[PDB]
């Protein structure tokens, strides 16, 4: 390999897995705290739609 | 036939490859200090535009 220091793939790769998963958190803890696991119409287009009509 | 003082063909010939390798260890302690092995384009003349790219 390059044993070097000026780049670090091992992290960086590290870094998107440790964000996917904060964020994943972060997408619960909120629907939690609302009761619903639908708050915004990112987590689900058809049943923002069909939910407000019910 | 051939031994004298005004010519010291042996000494040119250590010294030029004294300066041969303190050129090649001129170009190392740079690369290990800044971490690039490209540091000059005359390294590797292809490998800056690549490098510089990406």
């Given at each position: 390999?390059?044993?070097?220091?000026?780049?670090?793939?091992s992290?960086?790769?590290?870094?998107?897995?440790?964000?996917?998963?904060?964020?994943?958190?972060?997408?619960?803890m909120?629907?939690?705290?609302?009761?619903?696991?639908?708050?915004?119409?990112?987590?689900?287009?058809?049943?923002?739609?069909?939910?407000?009509?019910?």
């Amino acid at each position: 390999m390059a044993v070097n220091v000026n780049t670090n793939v091992s992290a960086m790769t590290a870094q998107r897995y440790l964000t996917s998963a904060t964020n994943a958190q972060q997408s619960s803890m909120e629907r939690l705290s609302s009761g619903y696991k639908i708050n915004s119409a990112k987590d689900d287009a058809a049943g923002l739609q069909i939910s407000n009509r019910l």
